[PDB]
Amino acid sequence: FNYIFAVSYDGELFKGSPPESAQASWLTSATRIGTKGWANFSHLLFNPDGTLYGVVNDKFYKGPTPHRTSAEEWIAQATLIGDGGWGAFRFLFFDPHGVLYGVTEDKLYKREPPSSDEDHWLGSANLLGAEGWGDFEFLFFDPEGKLYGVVNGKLHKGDPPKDRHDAWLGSSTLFKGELWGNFRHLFFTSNGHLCGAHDSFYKKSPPIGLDWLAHESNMVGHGGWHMFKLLISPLPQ
Protein backbone atom coordinates (compact mmCIF):
# COMPACT_ATOMS: atom_id res chain seq x y z
CA PHE A 1 0.00 0.00 0.00
CA ASN A 2 1.12 3.61 -0.82
CA TYR A 3 -0.66 7.06 -0.83
CA ILE A 4 -0.85 10.45 -2.47
CA PHE A 5 -1.30 13.40 -0.05
CA ALA A 6 -3.12 16.41 -1.50
CA VAL A 7 -3.51 19.93 -0.07
CA SER A 8 -6.49 21.68 -1.54
CA TYR A 9 -7.02 25.42 -2.06
CA ASP A 10 -9.60 25.22 0.65
CA GLY A 11 -6.70 24.38 3.10
CA GLU A 12 -7.78 20.69 3.52
CA LEU A 13 -5.30 17.83 3.41
CA PHE A 14 -6.36 14.46 1.88
CA LYS A 15 -4.76 11.01 1.88
CA GLY A 16 -5.64 8.41 -0.74
CA SER A 17 -4.52 5.57 -2.98
CA PRO A 18 -2.88 6.80 -6.19
CA PRO A 19 -5.49 7.31 -8.92
CA GLU A 20 -5.91 4.55 -11.49
CA SER A 21 -9.27 5.22 -13.04
CA ALA A 22 -9.60 8.14 -15.49
CA GLN A 23 -13.32 8.65 -14.84
CA ALA A 24 -13.13 8.24 -11.07
CA SER A 25 -13.32 11.11 -8.67
CA TRP A 26 -10.10 10.71 -6.60
CA LEU A 27 -11.51 12.82 -3.76
CA THR A 28 -14.40 10.34 -3.35
CA SER A 29 -11.86 7.64 -2.49
CA ALA A 30 -9.74 9.82 -0.18
CA THR A 31 -9.74 10.52 3.58
CA ARG A 32 -9.46 14.10 4.97
CA ILE A 33 -6.63 14.07 7.51
CA GLY A 34 -6.07 17.88 7.71
CA THR A 35 -9.11 20.09 8.33
CA LYS A 36 -8.05 23.66 7.53
CA GLY A 37 -5.08 25.96 7.15
CA TRP A 38 -2.95 23.44 5.11
CA ALA A 39 -2.54 25.76 2.06
CA ASN A 40 -0.75 28.28 4.38
CA PHE A 41 2.62 26.44 4.17
CA SER A 42 5.27 27.55 1.64
CA HIS A 43 6.69 23.99 1.72
CA LEU A 44 5.39 20.58 2.80
CA LEU A 45 7.46 17.43 2.46
CA PHE A 46 7.74 13.86 3.69
CA ASN A 47 10.76 12.34 5.35
CA PRO A 48 11.06 8.67 4.30
CA ASP A 49 10.81 7.83 8.04
CA GLY A 50 7.25 8.97 7.63
CA THR A 51 7.51 12.33 9.52
CA LEU A 52 5.97 15.36 7.87
CA TYR A 53 8.16 18.49 7.55
CA GLY A 54 6.79 21.90 6.73
CA VAL A 55 7.86 25.52 6.20
CA VAL A 56 5.32 28.17 7.21
CA ASN A 57 6.13 31.91 7.72
CA ASP A 58 9.85 31.33 7.14
CA LYS A 59 10.02 28.74 9.98
CA PHE A 60 10.68 24.93 9.54
CA TYR A 61 8.83 22.23 11.51
CA LYS A 62 8.55 18.51 11.82
CA GLY A 63 5.87 16.26 13.32
CA PRO A 64 3.71 13.13 12.77
CA THR A 65 1.24 12.99 9.90
CA PRO A 66 -1.95 14.72 11.04
CA HIS A 67 -5.01 12.68 12.05
CA ARG A 68 -7.93 15.10 11.53
CA THR A 69 -5.97 18.16 12.70
CA SER A 70 -5.86 21.85 11.69
CA ALA A 71 -2.55 23.26 10.41
CA GLU A 72 -2.60 25.50 13.56
CA GLU A 73 -2.90 22.52 15.93
CA TRP A 74 -0.18 20.66 14.01
CA ILE A 75 2.34 23.58 14.04
CA ALA A 76 1.64 24.26 17.74
CA GLN A 77 2.55 20.60 18.51
CA ALA A 78 5.42 20.23 15.97
CA THR A 79 9.17 20.52 16.80
CA LEU A 80 10.53 23.86 15.55
CA ILE A 81 13.72 22.98 13.66
CA GLY A 82 14.53 26.26 11.82
CA ASP A 83 13.66 29.94 11.99
CA GLY A 84 14.65 32.35 9.20
CA GLY A 85 15.80 31.67 5.62
CA TRP A 86 13.59 28.61 4.88
CA GLY A 87 10.84 30.34 2.90
CA ALA A 88 13.41 31.34 0.29
CA PHE A 89 14.34 27.67 -0.66
CA ARG A 90 13.24 27.06 -4.26
CA PHE A 91 13.25 23.26 -3.58
CA LEU A 92 13.46 21.36 -0.24
CA PHE A 93 13.16 17.58 -0.46
CA PHE A 94 14.51 14.37 1.07
CA ASP A 95 16.44 11.55 -0.58
CA PRO A 96 15.38 7.91 0.26
CA HIS A 97 17.99 8.04 3.09
CA GLY A 98 16.36 10.98 5.00
CA VAL A 99 19.18 13.42 3.88
CA LEU A 100 17.72 16.87 3.23
CA TYR A 101 18.38 18.56 -0.16
CA GLY A 102 17.70 22.19 -0.82
CA VAL A 103 18.12 24.75 -3.54
CA THR A 104 18.68 28.34 -2.47
CA GLU A 105 20.33 31.23 -4.28
CA ASP A 106 20.91 29.15 -7.39
CA LYS A 107 22.89 26.46 -5.52
CA LEU A 108 22.22 22.85 -4.43
CA TYR A 109 23.10 21.68 -0.92
CA LYS A 110 22.52 18.47 1.12
CA ARG A 111 22.77 17.58 4.79
CA GLU A 112 21.05 15.76 7.63
CA PRO A 113 17.93 17.86 8.43
CA PRO A 114 18.18 20.27 11.42
CA SER A 115 16.62 19.27 14.67
CA SER A 116 16.57 22.64 16.22
CA ASP A 117 16.48 26.28 15.14
CA GLU A 118 19.95 26.68 16.78
CA ASP A 119 21.37 24.37 14.18
CA HIS A 120 22.44 26.68 11.32
CA TRP A 121 21.76 24.21 8.52
CA LEU A 122 23.57 25.95 5.65
CA GLY A 123 26.58 26.45 7.98
CA SER A 124 27.59 22.76 7.68
CA ALA A 125 25.65 21.69 4.58
CA ASN A 126 27.45 19.98 1.63
CA LEU A 127 27.60 22.16 -1.47
CA LEU A 128 26.68 19.98 -4.42
CA GLY A 129 26.30 22.51 -7.23
CA ALA A 130 27.51 26.09 -7.34
CA GLU A 131 25.21 27.40 -10.08
CA GLY A 132 22.20 26.86 -12.36
CA TRP A 133 19.87 25.10 -9.91
CA GLY A 134 17.53 28.14 -9.60
CA ASP A 135 16.31 27.59 -13.19
CA PHE A 136 14.79 24.11 -12.54
CA GLU A 137 10.97 23.82 -12.54
CA PHE A 138 11.05 20.44 -10.67
CA LEU A 139 13.74 18.60 -8.77
CA PHE A 140 12.97 15.32 -6.97
CA PHE A 141 14.08 11.77 -6.23
CA ASP A 142 12.73 8.34 -7.13
CA PRO A 143 12.68 5.50 -4.46
CA GLU A 144 16.06 4.32 -5.83
CA GLY A 145 17.67 7.76 -5.16
CA LYS A 146 18.09 8.79 -8.75
CA LEU A 147 17.64 12.58 -9.10
CA TYR A 148 15.13 14.00 -11.70
CA GLY A 149 15.16 17.60 -12.81
CA VAL A 150 13.07 19.60 -15.28
CA VAL A 151 14.72 22.56 -17.03
CA ASN A 152 13.64 24.30 -20.24
CA GLY A 153 10.68 21.88 -20.20
CA LYS A 154 12.87 18.77 -20.53
CA LEU A 155 13.16 16.00 -17.90
CA HIS A 156 16.62 14.76 -16.97
CA LYS A 157 17.64 11.90 -14.60
CA GLY A 158 20.99 10.99 -13.12
CA ASP A 159 22.68 9.91 -9.86
CA PRO A 160 22.78 13.07 -7.73
CA PRO A 161 26.00 15.13 -7.92
CA LYS A 162 28.50 14.45 -5.14
CA ASP A 163 30.24 17.85 -5.14
CA ARG A 164 30.43 21.09 -7.08
CA HIS A 165 32.65 19.49 -9.77
CA ASP A 166 30.06 16.89 -10.91
CA ALA A 167 28.51 18.37 -14.10
CA TRP A 168 25.06 16.84 -13.35
CA LEU A 169 22.99 18.18 -16.28
CA GLY A 170 25.82 17.38 -18.72
CA SER A 171 25.99 13.66 -17.71
CA SER A 172 22.22 13.12 -17.18
CA THR A 173 19.76 10.96 -19.25
CA LEU A 174 17.11 12.78 -21.22
CA PHE A 175 13.43 11.80 -21.39
CA LYS A 176 11.48 12.38 -24.62
CA GLY A 177 9.24 15.48 -24.54
CA GLU A 178 9.56 19.25 -24.14
CA LEU A 179 6.35 20.05 -22.24
CA TRP A 180 7.38 18.70 -18.78
CA GLY A 181 7.12 22.28 -17.33
CA ASN A 182 3.37 22.28 -18.15
CA PHE A 183 2.67 19.97 -15.12
CA ARG A 184 1.90 21.63 -11.77
CA HIS A 185 3.05 18.44 -9.93
CA LEU A 186 5.59 15.85 -10.97
CA PHE A 187 6.81 13.23 -8.49
CA PHE A 188 7.17 9.50 -7.71
CA THR A 189 4.84 7.39 -5.51
CA SER A 190 6.35 5.30 -2.75
CA ASN A 191 6.21 2.29 -5.25
CA GLY A 192 8.01 4.10 -8.01
CA HIS A 193 5.13 5.26 -10.26
CA LEU A 194 5.88 8.54 -12.08
CA CYS A 195 3.01 11.00 -11.54
CA GLY A 196 2.30 14.25 -13.35
CA ALA A 197 -0.75 16.45 -12.87
CA HIS A 198 -2.20 19.72 -14.04
CA ASP A 199 -5.98 19.63 -14.45
CA SER A 200 -5.64 15.91 -15.31
CA PHE A 201 -3.46 13.30 -13.55
CA TYR A 202 -1.13 10.98 -15.61
CA LYS A 203 0.76 8.07 -14.11
CA LYS A 204 3.31 5.64 -15.46
CA SER A 205 3.83 2.35 -13.62
CA PRO A 206 7.33 0.77 -13.68
CA PRO A 207 9.32 0.32 -15.81
CA ILE A 208 9.05 4.06 -16.45
CA GLY A 209 11.25 4.04 -19.54
CA LEU A 210 11.95 7.39 -21.29
CA ASP A 211 8.64 8.16 -23.05
CA TRP A 212 6.54 11.27 -22.74
CA LEU A 213 4.27 11.01 -19.65
CA ALA A 214 1.11 12.93 -20.68
CA HIS A 215 -0.21 10.45 -23.28
CA GLU A 216 -3.83 9.56 -23.37
CA SER A 217 -2.81 5.98 -22.32
CA ASN A 218 -1.35 7.17 -18.95
CA MET A 219 -4.35 9.32 -17.92
CA VAL A 220 -5.70 8.20 -14.49
CA GLY A 221 -7.77 11.28 -13.48
CA HIS A 222 -9.48 13.26 -16.27
CA GLY A 223 -10.12 16.78 -14.96
CA GLY A 224 -10.54 18.42 -11.56
CA TRP A 225 -6.95 18.36 -10.21
CA HIS A 226 -6.63 22.20 -10.49
CA MET A 227 -8.22 22.21 -6.99
CA PHE A 228 -4.94 21.00 -5.32
CA LYS A 229 -2.10 23.34 -4.38
CA LEU A 230 0.20 20.44 -3.55
CA LEU A 231 0.36 16.64 -4.28
CA ILE A 232 3.15 14.70 -2.49
CA SER A 233 4.04 11.10 -1.67
CA PRO A 234 6.69 9.75 0.74
CA LEU A 235 9.62 7.68 -0.53
CA PRO A 236 10.35 4.52 1.45
CA GLN A 237 13.38 4.25 3.79
Numbering used by the authors: 13 to 249
Copy text from the publication:
We characterized the evolutionary trajectories and selection forces underlying emergence of β-propeller proteins, a globular and symmetric fold group with diverse functions. Propellers comprise four to eight blades arranged in radial symmetry, with each blade comprising a four-strand β sheet. Second, tachylectin-2 is an immunoprotein that agglutinates foreign cells by multivalent binding of surface GlcNAc- and GalNAc-decorated glycoproteins. The repeating motifs encode both the globular propeller fold and the rigid binding of saccharides between propeller blades.
To infer the ancestral motif from which tachylectin-2 may have diverged, we separated and aligned the five-sequence motifs of tachylectin-2 from T. tridentatus. The caveats associated with this inference are a limited number of sequences and unknown phylogeny (the species where the two lectins are found are not closely related). However, because of the high sequence identity and unambiguous alignment, the prediction seems comparatively robust (34 of 47 positions predicted with ≥90% probability).
